[PDB]
């Protein structure tokens, strides 16, 4: 079946301040 | 077996555990830079630009206003004169940061403003806090 | 004696708040509430919030920040972009879940390059191998 | 600044 | 003489056709043939057909009527949902039979409530009388 | 311990399945017959036709969205059999009863053939 | 005009287990 | 076992 994986890292880019 | 460079994990679901936190932070950066903000909340003397989608997500009051067709196209919202601009600023930051900052002498304000905005889960967390 | 409250400062961190905000944004999207753009991908379309798109995609951020393209209502992607690939990525933006089924792994990855979602790409390389 | 965590639901759930 | 085919306009109603279709739909499911979606319930997975899920569940109807999820292949339900309750209701969708026992009727009912299976809920309400 | 049987469930599922076809929802195959086309669900076509069950189980011929029937097949005869698969109702019109019966043989729907044989008179 | 019949036997093949 | 029949509608009706 579907193997589930966690990802503790940043998922998207960081809109600068 | 080795002659076949097929992509090894056939079907997989990757759960980006902090993607929600990352999206909310970037929404806050867009707020701070006044990017695609659609409404200004006027609380007594101060003004707060924000995104109606984030407001409807968190507040039952804002959800109820921006829901009927007649009111979701509003640019300026005036909260009741009794609403503390400090109390609202604390809650608005909570909407964009998941962090509710309670300094001494503000906890009753935050709790009263949360009742106004119909954020009953925050209100109940504050009830647990006092006690 | 005194019923004074807390004599100091304290910050309440609401775990799962961001998870609950995004789910409600997904609900608002599923109801065409305050959606401010449709993304045309070949013969398919998708309502979305330009705020969510800008948060997740370098490309959508690069476009909707430009003063001229700020108030755009329909965005047509390149005719080469795979809709099923983009569909999986738009779903990921609103759920935190990237579903890579055996059919279109390379499609999801390629569309993420096009969308300047380099963090998603680096994660497909991290786990998917040959 | 003593932090406190809260794992409950923070905001109402918008219906489907 | 005219060997003409009968008077003409006619219609035949196959009474058990609906049952034979659903039974064969289950055989396809039990052999995992053309299952096009996997429901994830508390890290336990169930494969099914999107069309059968839409026909039965008001929730799965709302979900796959929506453009984002209409052509996708994975659905994660609320993690509070009991997997046993869903499996009991998925077997009802394909067999017309609801296998509630004493002790899980409360889970079966509250899960039917989540799936917006309105008529199945009412049959459980009267089954506490 | 107990078990409830819903006697009209299968009938309600088939009606809803036809409503999905009616609104063109999750149709995953087009059946080309002479000039015309017919959108339907592969699961409903496999449940009812020995011939459709045969392709969509074949490994290579599973991921196809356009099936072309033999040019001899009458579209009007196929449409009558298609509406049958979704409604339990086989409408034998004034001039189609032989076409419907013939198309049913092609589709390996032996039970509908056998039923029409008991029906045809002359 | 619209004479109707009821066939109560099996209508379609039975997909094997 | 107890087998109880239900003659009513079992699922919602997808509108036309």
Numbering used by the authors:
A (entry chain C), G (entry chain G): 1340 to 1356
B (entry chain B): -4 to 126
C (entry chain A): -2 to 127
D (entry chain D), H (entry chain H): 1341 to 1356
E (entry chain F): -2 to 126
F (entry chain E): 6 to 127
Sentences from the paper on this structure:
Here, we report the functionalization of the BTB (bric à-brac, tramtrack and broad complex) domain from the transcriptional repressor BCL6 to serve as a promiscuous assembly block that may assist the crystallization of a guest protein. The 129-residue BCL6 BTB domain forms a symmetrical strand-exchanged homodimer that contains two lateral grooves that bind corepressors with high affinity. We showed that these can mediate the formation of a variety of highly porous lattices, and that a guest protein may be incorporated into a BTB-domain lattice by its genetic fusion to a corepressor peptide that binds to the lateral groove of the BTB domain with high affinity. We have shown that the surface of the BCL6 BTB domain contains versatile interaction interfaces with the potential to mediate diverse lattices in a range of crystallization conditions.
We reasoned that the high-affinity NCoR1BBD1 peptide would displace the NCoR1BBD2 residues from the BTB-domain β1 strand of the NCoR1BBD2-BCL6BTB chimera, whilst still leaving the NCoR1BBD2 sequence free to potentially interact with the HP of an adjacent BTB domain; this might result in the effective polymerization of the BTB homodimer. We crystallized the NCoR1BBD2-BCL6BTB chimera in the presence of the high-affinity NCoR1BBD1 peptide and solved the structure of the NCoR1BBD2-BCL6BTB/NCoR1BBD1 complex to 3.25 Å resolution [Fig. 2(b), Supplementary Fig. S3(a) and Table 1]. The high-affinity NCoR1BBD1 peptide interacted with the lateral groove of the BTB domain, and the N-terminal NCoR1BBD2 extension of the NCoR1BBD2-BCL6BTB chimera was displaced from the β1 strand as expected. The NCoR1BBD2 sequence interacted with the HP region of a neighbouring BTB dimer, and the BTB domains were arranged in distinct filaments that were formed by the back-to-back association of four BTB dimers [Supplementary Figs. S3(a) and S4]. The assembly of BTB dimers into filaments therefore involved two types of association: firstly the end-to-end stacking mediated by α5–α6 and secondly the association of the NCoR1BBD2 appendage with the HP region of an adjacent BTB molecule. This latter type of association between adjacent molecules has been described as ‘runaway domain coupling’ when occurring in solution in vivo; the strategy of combining runaway domain coupling with domain stacking leads to a stronger association between units and has been described in the formation of filaments from globular proteins. MAP_CHANNELS analysis revealed solvent channels of diameter ∼50 Å, and we therefore reasoned that we could adapt this system for the accommodation of a guest protein that is expressed as a genetic fusion to the NCoR1BBD1 sequence. Thus, upon crystallization in the presence of the high-affinity NCoR1BBD1 peptide, the two chimeric BTB domains each assembled into filaments that formed open lattices.
